[PDB]
Every structure is written in C-alpha cells, then in structure tokens.
Design a protein around this motif. Structure first.
Motif, short mmCIF file in Angstrom:
data_model
loop_
_atom_site.label_atom_id
_atom_site.label_comp_id
_atom_site.label_asym_id
_atom_site.label_seq_id
_atom_site.Cartn_x
_atom_site.Cartn_y
_atom_site.Cartn_z
N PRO A 55 0.83 -1.21 0.00
CA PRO A 55 0.00 0.00 0.00
C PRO A 55 0.86 1.25 0.00
N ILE A 56 0.84 1.96 -1.12
CA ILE A 56 1.58 3.21 -1.25
C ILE A 56 0.73 4.28 -0.59
N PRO A 57 1.23 4.94 0.45
CA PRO A 57 0.45 6.00 1.10
C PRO A 57 -0.03 7.01 0.07
N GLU A 58 -1.31 7.35 0.14
CA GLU A 58 -1.92 8.14 -0.92
C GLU A 58 -1.26 9.50 -1.05
N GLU A 59 -0.94 10.13 0.09
CA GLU A 59 -0.37 11.48 0.10
C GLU A 59 0.87 11.61 -0.78
N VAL A 60 1.70 10.57 -0.86
CA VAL A 60 2.90 10.68 -1.68
C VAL A 60 2.54 10.70 -3.16
N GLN A 61 1.55 9.91 -3.59
CA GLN A 61 1.26 9.78 -5.01
C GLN A 61 0.60 11.02 -5.61
N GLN A 62 0.07 11.91 -4.78
CA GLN A 62 -0.67 13.07 -5.25
C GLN A 62 0.12 14.36 -5.12
N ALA A 63 1.44 14.27 -4.94
CA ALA A 63 2.31 15.43 -4.89
C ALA A 63 3.29 15.46 -6.05
N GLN A 64 4.08 14.40 -6.22
CA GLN A 64 5.18 14.44 -7.17
C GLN A 64 4.71 14.14 -8.59
N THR A 65 4.00 13.04 -8.79
CA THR A 65 3.59 12.70 -10.14
C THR A 65 2.49 13.61 -10.66
N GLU A 66 1.79 14.34 -9.78
CA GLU A 66 0.79 15.30 -10.25
C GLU A 66 1.46 16.53 -10.84
N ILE A 67 2.33 17.18 -10.07
CA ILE A 67 3.20 18.23 -10.57
C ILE A 67 4.42 18.24 -9.65
N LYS A 68 5.61 18.14 -10.25
CA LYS A 68 6.75 17.51 -9.57
C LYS A 68 7.31 18.43 -8.49
N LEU A 69 6.61 18.44 -7.37
CA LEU A 69 6.81 19.39 -6.29
C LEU A 69 8.03 19.02 -5.46
N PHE A 70 8.13 19.68 -4.31
CA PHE A 70 8.78 19.20 -3.10
C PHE A 70 7.67 18.70 -2.16
N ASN A 71 8.06 17.89 -1.17
CA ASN A 71 7.09 16.98 -0.53
C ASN A 71 5.89 17.73 0.05
N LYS A 72 6.11 18.90 0.65
CA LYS A 72 5.00 19.76 1.08
C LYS A 72 5.02 21.13 0.42
N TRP A 73 6.14 21.84 0.51
CA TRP A 73 6.25 23.20 0.00
C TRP A 73 6.41 23.22 -1.51
N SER A 74 5.71 24.14 -2.15
CA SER A 74 5.70 24.25 -3.61
C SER A 74 7.04 24.80 -4.06
N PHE A 75 7.95 23.91 -4.44
CA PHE A 75 9.23 24.31 -4.98
C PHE A 75 9.10 25.16 -6.23
N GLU A 76 7.88 25.33 -6.73
CA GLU A 76 7.63 25.92 -8.04
C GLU A 76 7.84 27.43 -7.96
N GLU A 77 7.38 28.13 -8.98
CA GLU A 77 7.99 29.40 -9.37
C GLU A 77 8.08 30.40 -8.23
N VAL A 78 9.31 30.86 -7.98
CA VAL A 78 9.67 31.80 -6.93
C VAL A 78 10.76 32.70 -7.52
N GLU A 79 10.47 33.99 -7.69
CA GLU A 79 11.44 34.87 -8.34
C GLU A 79 12.44 35.44 -7.33
N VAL A 80 13.60 35.85 -7.85
CA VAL A 80 14.67 36.47 -7.06
C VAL A 80 14.63 37.98 -7.28
N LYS A 81 14.53 38.74 -6.20
CA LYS A 81 14.26 40.18 -6.30
C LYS A 81 15.53 41.02 -6.48
N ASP A 82 16.59 40.42 -7.05
CA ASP A 82 17.86 41.10 -7.29
C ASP A 82 18.48 40.50 -8.54
#
Ligand SMILES: [Mg+2]
Ligand SMILES: [Mg+2]
Ligand SMILES: [Mg+2]
Ligand SMILES: [Mg+2]
Ligand SMILES: [Mg+2]
Ligand SMILES: [Mg+2]
Ligand SMILES: [Mg+2]
Ligand SMILES: [Mg+2]
Ligand SMILES: [Mg+2]
Ligand SMILES: [Mg+2]
Ligand SMILES: [Mg+2]
Ligand SMILES: [Mg+2]
Lengths: 61, 145, 70, 143, 135, 79, 206, 67
Positions: G9-36
RNA sequence: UUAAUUGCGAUAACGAACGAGACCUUAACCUACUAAAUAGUGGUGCUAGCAUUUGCUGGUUAUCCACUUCUUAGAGGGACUAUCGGUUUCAAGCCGAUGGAAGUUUGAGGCAAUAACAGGUCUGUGAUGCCCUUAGACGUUCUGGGCCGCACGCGCGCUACACUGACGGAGCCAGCGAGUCUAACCUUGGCCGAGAGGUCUUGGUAAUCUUGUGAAACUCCGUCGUGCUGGGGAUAGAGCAUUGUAAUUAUUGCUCUUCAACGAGGAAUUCCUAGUAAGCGCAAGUCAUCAGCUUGCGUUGAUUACGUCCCUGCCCUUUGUACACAC
C-alpha cells in the motif's frame, strides 16, 4: 538609494599584496556605452552582474 | 498530563534535617540538597515510599515524608540492598548505615582521624593537604590558596 | 525576570487571551510573553492540543508548532 | 491481509503493542526492578520504572522474530550504549546481563521464545503466531 | 541483477516478471525511517512511471556502510532495476526514457558515486591533517 | 579428494593449481582472500627526529587412488 | 490526479504530490522569483528537490556550488561550531521545521522569504586592507555576486547560532525569527545589522 | 601535470619514422598496434606512446613535425 | 612551458650516468572468461505464521537441480587528458565541453640522487677502537625503595562550560584486523549476580568459530527549563569484585555517596582544500593487569579558496661583498 548596475565585460587580472582582488572592466546594460574598471572582492567571472554605490570614480591597485 | 490548579498548599522554604530546600523545584533533585542524598538513592526511596514523581516539591505531608526520614536512617529494613549505602560494613561496629545531613562530614572526620592518629599514609597525607589517591602531583593542581 | 512554574491565573487566562495577532504558539512563546516558565508549557501545549484553538502542523518531538483558529 | 511484523513500522508497533503485555498481566517480572539501570555503561535507572520491561520484552521478540536465534550476551551488546567514563574517552559498554536473561526466560513462560536445538533462542512455535496478530490490530486503524 | 553503492553499502535486486510488493530488507519500502530520507528512496519513480509495478521484481537488502550510505545504495539498486528489465525485454527505448528522466535529475541513481575515503598517513589523525607543532 | 594449498609468492602457487586441473583430466575424468600481515614500526633505531612510521607486509594467498599418491610429488597439504 | 496502488500500500499522500506536478514533498518548490537581478544565475530553485540532502560533489571544481540547490546550500552552514559537525540529518530537520515555523506567520511559500532575505542581506560594497601595515589605508572595493550570497548565508546561520545558545527559544525558532526580518527593512536582524555595519566608509573610500 | 617526457616523445617518433606505412588518427587502433612491434612494459606506458603518436598523426597531415 | 633540469625551442657545444618521471603498491569498474558449504542469490523438498487464489514474512544446519549480479582472487580489459571547440606564438602545452567507473601526474602511498651535519644512537645488537671496572665488582643475582615524590614555568593531549544539549526508553548501520598443543589464546550459548563479575558447557590454528564484531556519533519517542541546573565530574569517604608471589603511594572494573574550577579562553600559536576538515567510535601495537598514546580502519560529513608574494620560506638567474669558523 543611489545605486547602479554593472556586468563584467572582462577580468583585467589581480592586484592586492595578498592576491585576493580582481580588476574588471564593466558596463551598465541598456544603451550599454559605459566602461570603467572597478576592483572586486569575492570570486567573479564573465557576465556576473554586480552592484555599484557610485556610478563612476573607480580605483586600481 | 494536563492542567490542575491546586490551592495555596505549595511552599518555598521547607527545613528538613537541618537543611532548607527550595519548593518551586521539582522533587527528586530538591532532595540532593542534602549531603548523602545523591540522585540514585534519592530516585529510589521516594518511589519505595509510594509518591508520584511528576509532582513538584510544594505538595505532600509530614508523614508523607516521615515516610522518608525513617526510610533513610533505617533503610536496611526496607528492601533497599546494601550496595546502595555510602557506609556499608562500617569499621566502628560492622553495621551498615547511610551517613546524611551532618553525619557525612562527621563520620568522614572519623575516617580521616582514625588514619591521621594511627599515622597511616592516607592519614598524615591527608593532614598535609596532598592527594591521598596516588595521582601525579607535579604537573597538576596548583592555583588554589 | 525570575519566572514561574505553576498554573494559577493572573495573566494565565491571558493563557486564554492566547491567539489574535500572534499566530504561532509554542513553548518559547509561552515563557516570553511576560509570562510563565516552560516545563508546564509542555503539558499545556499538550493540554490545548487535546481540545483548544491550537492545531498541530509539526509532528516532531523537539519543537511543536501550533497556530490560531485558522 | 497477510500481515507479518516486517510490514508494520518498528517504534509504534514495539511500543503500542508492549502495552498489550501490560493489558494481560501474565507478567513474571523480576522484582529487582526499581533497582537497576540496565547497564553499568549508563548512569540513571530507567526513567519510567513503571514499565519498560514490556518495551524490552517487545524489543527482544521483534528481533527474535525478525531473525533466527538470539543469545543472552548479544542483548547486552545491543542496548548497552556508551559509558560516560568521566574525563576519559567514551567507550561502548555492554548492558545488564541479569535484566536480559530474565526476559529471555519469562518469554517462554508465555510461549513466544523457544530454546533453539542449535543453542541460542528460537522464535517459538506459537511466537510466530501472536506477533503477526498485533500487526492488523495496529495497521487496520493506522492508514 | 542490479548494483547499489554509496561507500561500502551495497544493495541488490533482480530482473523477471513480478509482484507489486516492493521489499526493503524484509520490511517493505513503505517505511524505511531514516525518517525524512524516505523521499530519497521514493524519488525515482516519480518523474514518469507511477504504477503497473505489480509485475515488478523488487526485493532489496542492504549490508555495509551506515544509515545514509544504505539509503543512497538502495536507490542505486532500484533505479538501475527498472532500466535492467528494459535491456532485451519490454522495449529499450524505455531504457532511454528512464535513464533519460532519472539521470536528468541524477542524484547518484544510475552512476555510482565514486567517492572513496582516503588512507591516513602517520603524524596525524587524518589523511591530510597533522599533529600540533611546538617551536 | 580435496586439497588446500598456500604460499606467499603467486607464480609457483599457481603452477600447481593449473598442474592439478590438468591431472584432473589425467584419464579424461572429473581463490581465498589474500591475507596481508602488517608490521608497523618506526624507521629510527633510537628515538630521534621526525617521528617516522613504516608498515611492512606479508602476502599470504590460499586456494582450493594409485593416482592419488603420485600427485603430491610452495606449501603442500591435502585432506 | 492518478490515484493507484500495488501489493505494498503506497500511502496516498505521496502519489498526489510528485507525479501530479513535480513538487517538493510539502512546499511548492515551483515558481519563486529572485528580487535582485545580480543573483540571476546565482540561485538554484528549479530544479526542485523533495529533501535537502542531495549529497553531491560541489567542491572539487571551482564555481559549482552555484549549481547546488540553494536550499541544500544553507542546510550545510548550520552544522558547525564544532560539536554539530557531521550531522546533516540534524540540520535538514531544522529547515523543514523552520519552513512552517515561517509559514505560520503569513502564508505563501517560505522557500522565498529566505531568498527575499538574502538579496537584502548581501553587502553591496565593502572595505579591506591595503599593502600598508599599521599605517594601512582601507580602500573600498565592491562585492561579488557570489560572495554577497556565500557570506549572507553564514551571516544568517551565525546570528541564530549565538542566540539559540543559552536562550529558551529553539534553534529553528531563532533563524525563523531572523530570516523573516531580512525579507526587507529589518533594522532588528543580526545579519542585516552586519551588512549595514560592513558598508563602512564604503561609497567614500571607493 | 600533463607534459609527456622524452621516453614517450623519443619512442613515439621512433615509430613514425619506420611505420608511417599504416598508423592512424584513432588512438585505440595504435594502442593494439604498439605492443605488436614494440616491447613497452606497462599499459600506461604504451597508452602514452600511443596517445602521443596518435597526437603527432592528428597533426602530421598539415606540415611535417620537426624531426 | 610543466608539479618537475618536465618538455618545446634556443645554442661552443656534442653525446651520455644517477635524481624527476617510468616503476611497484592500494583505491575506484568489469553483467567479459576461468570459477566456488569456508562466498551468496533464485528454485525445490519439508515446517512454522498471517490473509486466503495461493499472496506477504520467515524457518528450512544436503532438502535435489540450476545460476556466478552482490563476494573472494587468478588471467586480463579499460583513460591516452580520447573526441570536439577555444587557445596558442610553429610548437611544448594550457583552458572549456561532450563522453566516462574513472580527466588535481585520476585519488593516496612505496621508492628516491650528489654533497653534507662533528645532527641523533656505544641505553637494540654476541657491532665496535681506546679508556675505566673486574671479587668489599660498575659483573650477576636476591630483598626492599625510586623512576610517579610538589611553593612553581612550558610542550603533546583527554574531558567540558550545555536546550544543534543531558538523560531514559527505542530504532539500529561499518570497515582494517588479531586469536591455543612441550598448551590454557579469541570466546558464542545455557544458568547466578543490580554491577563489576562468577560459572558449566561450546565452536575456531580461523573467508567456517568468536563476528553481521547489533561500535559510537547518529535516528524515532519522552523527561528536564536557564540559573553553575538534571550542564560539569575534579576531589574525597565507604563497600563489592578482577589481574597478579605481592595492589600501601587508590593497577583496573563496579555500587552508593561527596559534587571543585570551568559562564567560551589575553598577547600569541598549530593544522587543513574532498568523502578532505572536523565529530564519532572500532581493531592492532603495548599487554598478567592498566590508554587520556601511537599505527590503521570505517560511520556522519560541511564551511572556504582552485589565488598572491604581504609575513614565513624554497628554487633559478643577474648583481654587490672587507664574508670562507661563510650575516
Ligand atoms: Mg540502546
Ligand atoms: Mg547502542
Ligand atoms: Mg620562540
Ligand atoms: Mg635526499
Ligand atoms: Mg654533538
Ligand atoms: Mg660499551
Ligand atoms: Mg619516566
Ligand atoms: Mg609533540
Ligand atoms: Mg551529568
Ligand atoms: Mg540518546
Ligand atoms: Mg606556522
Ligand atoms: Mg607510547
């Protein structure tokens, strides 16, 4: 907040008696047209944009 | 556990065997405030005197800890073995005590005096201020007085 | 300050004035706010975890993190 | 669903199940508990002292089930950490022998450990039974 | 028949038609619990290929090294496991579809971390460092 | 039959291993880890100077009726 | 979102984070701009990672620690003052703690209120030692696009290190209570108090 | 770090004078050519003659090399 | 130009010897052959447990066939900076990249010249010149003490000032090694003991047995709450064990008790550039007993430079000298 931009065109070389500084030619980008030789502290290579606290009056040695 | 409030039956300042002990302090260590009461031997008597250890020093009754004074000065009769005792087998009388409060220094004095007057090595070596335990004496232990 | 180790109520229903405009709450927040000392602040973070406004985000021994009624 | 112990995590199983041996009271504890540390190579007696024989008895059976045959000595090596030898380097010191032997005893007084024909201690005939039993207790309400 | 290595940790697996149970040591992968390095082991399968691993040959056992050379070793076994039954089996363009996605994130999954520890020379408690000096 | 053979040099150690898989077909019929013994002492005979250390090494490699008694004629041993 | 399972049994929470959109496990590694704009190319968000322990060779050649995931970059400058040396696992637990220790003070992705806290923690100019010797002049020289990064890290870790020391608060609670101010106009943050301290006779000595 | 000595440079050109008959711009071919006609001791020894002979060849096309 | 008197080149020099390098060793890979109850895996005979189309987890001390990926060591393969670009100044080379287990001589070692030092060693030699001693002996043995002795200065280190912690349960992962018959080495398993340790068996001359050396830091769960505190364990008392003819001036281990300085170390100063620094333990030397030492081995694993000649200092020219016992 008197600042200005500058990316490094080339690295003239090193100075400093212990050898931990680099001479760089530089310019501000849009309507580039600048060229002035500042000395810089931590490691720097080509196209490294970097800060400036007065747009001219650089140094050497 | 969870919260109680209790009424005004807690105290700082509580004198037991010539030594006052802070009350705001959790229990089993506010006992070490007595010479002869370490941590091993304080941890044990107050469970083999049936008290709950989660409680600070502010609770309890006199015969809840006269439960402990007659335990501590007569422990041979209380299921605690002989290898827990700072004085076992004695040398004056062969019977096993636990030196406490003042009794530690006094029957330490006897231990030193019994040797100091017999002019044993440890005896007049103690009488000089030097290390009785055979350690090196040139490299170490200087600033002092 | 010299700090405290039991649960009367002087500013200790300021232990119930215990949310708005300071969201995060845990042991360190309890001791600082001109307030308690922090060993009864561990059963208390266990006590309002039982049924209080604080809800756990943090699953680990070393630090608990609890927030407001969000 | 076909549950062995290997399919349940260690900590929550070894611990929450060790409360089962409390629930029953088929104890045979040594009674010298309240005076022990489990090792010379540590300093304080076990913090709880209201238990931890269950946790220890859980622990040994978990390893005894998980592998073939155990011994009294190897228990001492495992739990025994490092003695704070004071001002000298720390060392691995083994654990209490009387503690561990009296649990390898009181567990075939319950039918969980055998005495391997090769020497050592086999997981008993019925030990392989009641251990997997606590899995689906823990698992089927922990998903 | 795939390798797995970090320093002296080695991890092993095998190649044929399989089960669905993915077995770590004996205790299957579900929880491995160097608590938060679980996402290290979970990591491969997630770029592409999230299921039909019920026909999958994943038993893995680890020996040597320690609590983190093993986690790096097992992922060295699992990831090379998939591209192993994609050699003269279900098509090899999939080898170049996993070796693609694994290695284009490769945190040492297909290619073994070569880093071995340096012999210590005398006059010091180290390969490089030296005892203290007194003039 | 079963033979176990050992020596320090490897050539005449393996000039019998081959010389026995060829008496294995004598009528068309039917590697251990190397042990390195380390002595690690000081170069200096007395006590002087830079404190210099020096490992030596021994390498020990081991391997494994009328025709039986005329096969044993490097450290030779068989049981 | 592709829920699916096998014999383990693959815990459901893991399958709905990475293969859905390839995140980091909780925090959205996705678009974050650098202000410099000078940290363009000197920051390693995207490619994302699920855990901050991608043990890799970022040292044997020179500039590479630029390409190191700029979050594993800081989880390293924490394991020091000697006792904590080694011990990456103790460090990476401090960061994932600090993320939501940050996140419980206004939402939206603490993976940025760290980098928002380094662009204003980088000292623009700096002053160093001439040949001289005793009578040595202090000529100012501007500061590197990468030094402004390297040093605002150890500047930030240090402020937390010496305030966690002996005070009741946690180490994750300290640098959380320190990263946040550096997001802008801190005036009460250790590392900001040092960058602004370090710009001394700065645009004057030039 | 990477300066080949006269043991290779002499031997490497010791061949090109007697075997420009054959010899190629590809390393591994000369690799297995070398030990046929030469008596190099180690592989690293041979692989460095070959690496240079090939290097002289990869440049022999455009103008002869002094000597 | 290279780490290089390493090479390109330039040349009243030419051609040569040693040193560098080559070499040897070890660390990386190898699905290539030879192959294997002293190494493993898969299968199968037999059996435990769980849910039941037969699935998970074990046991299975030949229960039979098959395999050689993990492991061992033989034969070897492999990197040569290959290839592509940028670069050179023709070059020698250097820089970038792709590829690769591998691209700082691939990483680390062993080896290492000429000339020297009044360097150190006659306290390793049954190596040794000369001197001294040779029976009331400086020979040798025996008894007992000392090398440890404590107003003080210094060198190598061990342990700590804590909350990235201490402690208590709990999880549980290495590698290099050593080990017994003109004998008592390494020790599993059974009991006894709180411990130290005691005891009746036991296996191993060792890829077999001790040993997966279940190491320690570390990891999960709890307790403590900022102040000398449960940080710290020095000093000392009392008792129990072990080594040994012999423990006193505690050999060492254990139990309880006593609970000092130390609140991050002035001027100074050591070491270090990758699986390295540092943290952590383990084996081996020693060894009857005693590691705070050393020789190694792995486990956790960073920060910071990939630069200069400022200091300390080496090398090569040119230069000046009243130096030659040589600033
Ligand atoms: Mg333990
Ligand atoms: Mg342990
Ligand atoms: Mg001096
Ligand atoms: Mg020499
Ligand atoms: Mg002399
Ligand atoms: Mg003589
Ligand atoms: Mg001496
Ligand atoms: Mg020294
Ligand atoms: Mg302590
Ligand atoms: Mg612990
Ligand atoms: Mg120095
Ligand atoms: Mg010594």
């Amino acid at each position: 907040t008197p600042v200005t931009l500058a990316k490094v065109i080339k690295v003239l070389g090193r100075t400093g008696s212990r050898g931990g500084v680099t001479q760089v030619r530089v310019e501000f980008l849009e309507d580039t047209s600048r060229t002035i030789v500042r000395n810089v502290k931590g490691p720097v290579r080509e196209n490294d944009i970097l800060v400036l606290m007065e747009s001219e009056r650089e140094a050497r040695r | 556990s969870l919260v109680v409030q209790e009424q005004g039956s807690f105290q700082h300042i509580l004198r037991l065997l010539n030594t006052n002990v802070d009350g705001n302090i959790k229990i089993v260590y506010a006992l070490t405030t007595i010479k002869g009461v370490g941590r091993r031997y304080s941890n044990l008597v107050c469970k083999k005197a049936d008290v709950d250890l989660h409680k600070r020093a502010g609770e309890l009754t006199q015969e809840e800890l006269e439960r402990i004074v007659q335990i501590m000065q007569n422990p041979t009769h209380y299921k605690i073995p002989a290898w827990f005792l700072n004085r076992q087998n004695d040398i004056t009388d062969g019977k096993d005590y636990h030196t406490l409060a003042n009794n530690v220094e006094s029957k330490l004095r006897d231990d030193l005096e019994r040797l100091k007057k017999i002019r044993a090595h440890r005896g007049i070596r103690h009488f000089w201020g030097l290390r009785v335990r055979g350690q090196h004496t040139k490299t170490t232990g200087r600033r002092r007085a | 300050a010299q700090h405290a180790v039991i649960l009367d109520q002087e500013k200790y229903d300021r232990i119930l004035k215990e949310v708005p405009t300071y969201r995060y709450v845990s042991v360190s927040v309890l001791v600082d706010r001109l307030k308690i000392g922090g060993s009864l602040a561990r059963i208390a973070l266990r006590h309002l975890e039982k049924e209080g406004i604080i809800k756990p985000i943090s699953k680990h021994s070393k630090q608990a993190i609890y927030t407001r009624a969000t | 669903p076909g549950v062995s112990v290997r399919d349940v995590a260690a900590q929550d199983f070894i611990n929450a199940y060790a409360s089962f041996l409390q629930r029953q009271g088929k104890l045979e504890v040594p009674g010298y508990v309240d005076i022990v540390k489990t090792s010379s190579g540590n300093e304080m007696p076990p913090q709880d002292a209201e238990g931890w024989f269950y946790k220890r008895a859980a622990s040994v059976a978990r390893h005894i089930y998980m592998r073939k045959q155990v011994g009294v000595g190897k228990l001492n090596k495992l739990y025994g950490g490092a003695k704070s030898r004071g001002v000298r380097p720390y060392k691995h010191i083994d654990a209490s022998g009387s503690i561990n032997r009296k649990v390898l005893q009181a567990l075939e007084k319950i039918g969980i450990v055998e005495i391997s024909p090769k020497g050592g201690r086999r997981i008993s005939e019925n030990g392989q039974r009641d251990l997997d039993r606590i899995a689906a207790q823990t698992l089927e309400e922990d998903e | 028949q795939t390798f797995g290595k970090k320093k002296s940790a080695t991890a092993v697996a095998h190649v044929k038609a399989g089960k669905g149970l993915i077995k770590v040591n004996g205790s299957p992968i579900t929880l491995v619990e160097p608590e938060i390095l679980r996402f290290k082991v979970y990591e491969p399968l997630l770029l592409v290929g999230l299921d039909k691993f019920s026909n999958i040959d994943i038993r893995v056992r680890v020996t040597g090294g320690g609590h983190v050379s093993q986690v790096y070793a097992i992922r060295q076994a699992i990831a090379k496991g998939l591209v192993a039954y994609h050699q003269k089996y279900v098509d090899e363009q999939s080898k170049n579809e996993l070796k693609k996605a694994f290695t284009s994130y490769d945190r040492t999954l297909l290619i073994a971390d070569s880093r071995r520890p340096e012999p210590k020379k005398f006059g010091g408690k180290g390969a490089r460092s030296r005892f203290q000096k007194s003039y | 039959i079963r033979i176990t053979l050992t020596s320090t040099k490897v050539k005449q150690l393996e000039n019998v291993s081959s010389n026995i898989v060829k008496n294995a077909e004598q009528h068309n019929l039917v590697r251990l880890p190397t042990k390195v013994l380390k002595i690690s002492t000081r170069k200096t005979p007395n006590g002087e100077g830079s404190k210099t250390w020096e490992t030596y090494e021994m390498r020990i490699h081991k391997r494994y009726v009328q025709i039986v008694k005329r096969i044993t004629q490097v450290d030779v041993e068989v049981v | 979102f592709t829920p699916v399972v096998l014999a383990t049994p693959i815990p459901e929470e893991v399958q709905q984070a990475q293969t859905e959109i390839k995140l980091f496990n909780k925090w959205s590694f996705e678009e974050v701009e650098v202000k410099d704009a000078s940290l363009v190319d000197y920051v390693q968000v995207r490619q994302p990672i699920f855990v901050a322990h991608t043990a890799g060779r970022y040292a044997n050649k020179r500039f590479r620690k630029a390409q190191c995931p700029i979050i594993e970059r800081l989880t390293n400058s924490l394991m020091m003052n000697g006792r904590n040396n080694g011990k990456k696992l103790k460090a990476v637990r401090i960061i994932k703690h600090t993320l939501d220790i940050i996140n419980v003070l206004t939402d939206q992705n603490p993976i940025q209120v760290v980098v928002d806290a380094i662009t204003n923690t980088g000292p623009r100019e700096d002053t160093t030692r001439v040949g001289g010797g005793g009578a040595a002049r202090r000529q100012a020289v501007d500061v590197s696009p990468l030094r402004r990064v390297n040093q605002a890290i150890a500047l930030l870790t240090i402020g937390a290190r010496e305030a966690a020391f002996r005070n009741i608060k946690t180490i994750a609670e300290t640098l959380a209570e320190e990263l946040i101010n550096a997001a802008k106009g801190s005036s009460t943050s250790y590392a900001i108090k040092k960058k602004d301290e370090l710009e001394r006779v700065a645009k004057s000595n030039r | 770090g990477r300066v080949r000595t006269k043991t290779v440079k002499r031997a490497s050109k010791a061949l090109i004078e007697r075997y420009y008959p054959k010899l190629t711009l590809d390393f591994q071919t000369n690799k297995r050519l070398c030990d046929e006609i030469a008596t190099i001791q180690s592989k690293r020894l041979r692989n460095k003659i070959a690496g240079y002979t090939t290097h002289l060849m990869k440049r022999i096309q455009k103008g002869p090399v002094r000597g």
